[PDB]
Amino acid sequence: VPKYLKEPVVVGYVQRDSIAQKIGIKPGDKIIKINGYEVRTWEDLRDALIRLSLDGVKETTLFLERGVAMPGAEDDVVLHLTIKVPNVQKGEELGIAPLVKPVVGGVKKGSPADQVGIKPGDLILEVNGKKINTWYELVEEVRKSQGKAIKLKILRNGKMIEKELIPAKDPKTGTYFIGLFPKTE
Amino acid sequence: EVQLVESGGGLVQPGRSLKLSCAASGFTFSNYGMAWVRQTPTKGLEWIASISAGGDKTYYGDSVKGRFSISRDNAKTTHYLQMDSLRSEDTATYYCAKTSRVYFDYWGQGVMVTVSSAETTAPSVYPLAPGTALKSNSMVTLGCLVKGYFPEPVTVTWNSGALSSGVHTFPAVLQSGLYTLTSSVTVPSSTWSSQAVTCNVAHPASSTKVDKKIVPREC
Amino acid sequence: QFVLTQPNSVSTNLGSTVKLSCKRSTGNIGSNYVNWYQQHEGRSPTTMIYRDDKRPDGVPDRFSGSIDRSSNSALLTINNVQTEDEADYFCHSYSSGIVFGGGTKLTVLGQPKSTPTLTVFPPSTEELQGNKATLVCLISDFYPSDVEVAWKANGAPISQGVDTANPTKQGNKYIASSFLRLTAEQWRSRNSFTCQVTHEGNTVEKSLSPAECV
């Protein structure tokens, strides 16, 4: 059971022409229920969809939170989206995926990341004051700075912390690196 | 040391001809009869043609319905099988063999003949390097992906054959009439970081000869 | 003017004695010499026995040939069978024509169990430039040959685009390979892929991910 499957269902990718795409699900959406079944993890979503399919259910009701709620309005009823139940017999899927999140899996010894004490388990929320939701976004933001200082806003054990580091040149590649490995397992 | 070396095979459309040659050494060529025997996955080993030590007499197997003819040239220590009116059922590996009165004592390495109306497709060659990791090993496995070719075979060497230890050419898969294989080599990490490692891929049927240097994956 | 018939397949314990038979369909087995060729996977045949019972220089003396007139059969006997005796064996005779048996594949049971080594590779930059991605899984150094190979995407079974070679012998152990064909977008949209190999009641796996170091 890869750890990423045990996280909340925050959509990172929507496949063009999928059930999800045509019903208007978008990156960022958080799926919390289908028909019924409470959805707390990617595993719950997969299990519910397989059960509905094998049970002969053809359409069902999908509940998602989109974007940040106003203080006090977080518990407000969210109405159904009606989705076709993917045909598991034909290997059809909903069309959503998490993508790897910006969670540090490992730190290279002696790297800038190590020197400034970034740790496995850290979640990077912002890079040079820009919010990021995916590992891909981390990569592109870090790559943009091309040698300049990088400010990272990190979440560690419920506590937001600030880090600043200078990327290091690798003479082997002629490119900069900060020394962060993803968590993919 | 006896050596028998076939050549002249490859891809041919139904109805056309090939001419296989077998070049012999390490024995008195004129002292022994020569032969061709072919092999397929399903039909096994199947005698095709024989010629007497002097060239006087020729014999042909059942399925070669006087479509082929064997001959020899003792001066050149070589014999030939001319193959006309090839059909798809002629697709096989063809071996040359030397005789010793009552058996075939030595066999060549075999040459593949594909009879098909499908045209040759040249492979795409891509480098395979391990994904970047924190932990590294003392030996490393590199590879070359030889993707989407027809027909068999391809050959892969490494550093023009200077790197021969730890080489594995994995048998191809076949999907939608095209073959794919990978060749791998395990080399010391110290060899990889101190000199170039290159696979040399050859696909005779498409006259493809390609070199791919394997370079480390970066960040 | 006759056929030679051999059993397709024969299994024997390491160290034991095995007899491989070759039956002539018509005419007496005794009227023409029978020879025996060994062929290892991907190699040329070599002579094991000639003129019924002659063993060439270089062939171990554990190999012997005989003719059984009562069953109109030739027999290749291998005593104290070794791992390297795994091969196909073809008998051969002639009269007017030249005839081969259909070959027997000999399996040697009870060898040391050997768990597969997996090596996985992600798609190259070059291939992704054409918007394609082939994942490669090499499976080596296993015995016995019997394995099942499966892929997973995001820890879930994936069968679409999977091409897996049957195991083949190199040296004294087997290799196989498996490919997962994806589009660039299929590759990038996943957190990981896993090549899984089941062997002798255990599974061994290795994963690849499009997410790289920064």
Curated annotation (Swiss-Prot), chain A:
Domain PDZ: 82-158
Recorded superkingdom: Bacteria
Location(s), subcellular: Cell inner membrane
Family classification: Belongs to the peptidase M50B family.
UniProt-recorded name of the protein: Putative zinc metalloprotease aq_1964
Species this chain originates from: Aquifex aeolicus (strain VF5)
Residues included from the entire protein: 116 to 292 of 429
